[PDB]
Amino acid sequence: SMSYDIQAWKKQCEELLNLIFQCEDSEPFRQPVDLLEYPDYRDIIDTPMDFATVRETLEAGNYESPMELCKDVRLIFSNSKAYTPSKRSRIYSMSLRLSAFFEEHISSVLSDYKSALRFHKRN
């Protein structure tokens, strides 16, 4: 059961998403971009992603691992870097700060999960 629990990441990710939604820096990234308020968005971005979509995908049980969730979160930030490439932009700075916060906190979730996997595979 509790040591090396291969399902513990789910609640840990739910908690991290709660922290992210609290952050003022997540405001531009909470919901899908409105494709009529920004009609050139899809000209630039192939695969839109936002934190409400990540949170619903997790709730629906559609991530097989925390690495899958992490891929979608990283897409939020890589899409922002493509759409708002200027380091002058306060939106660029927001994305950088929130990315760094996410990467700090996801680190232990991933390493713990992979350790659990290695242990169960070995035994």
Ligand X SMILES: N#Cc1nc(Cc2ccccc2)oc1N
Q: Which residues bind ligand X (CB under 6 A)?
A: 28-29, 33, 38, 80, 83-84, 89, 91
Minimum distance of ligand X from residue 118's CB (angstroms): 37
Decide whether 4 or 41 has the Cβ nearer to ligand X. 41
Minimum distance of ligand X from residue 88's CB (angstroms): 10
First to last CA, the chain: 14
Give Cα 113 to chain centroid, integer Å.
16
Decide whether 28 or 72 has the Cβ nearer to ligand X. 28
Give Cα 105 to chain centroid, integer Å.
11
Side-chain-facing half-sphere of 84: CA atoms under 13 Å: 16
CB-CB contact of 94 with 25 (8 Å): yes
Q: How far apart are CA 113 and CA 86, in angstroms?
A: 36
Decide whether 26 or 58 has the Cβ nearer to ligand X. 26
Minimum distance of ligand X from residue 65's CB (angstroms): 26
Minimum distance of ligand X from residue 95's CB (angstroms): 7
Residue with tokens 């097989």: 64
Decide whether 83 or 102 has the Cβ nearer to ligand X. 83
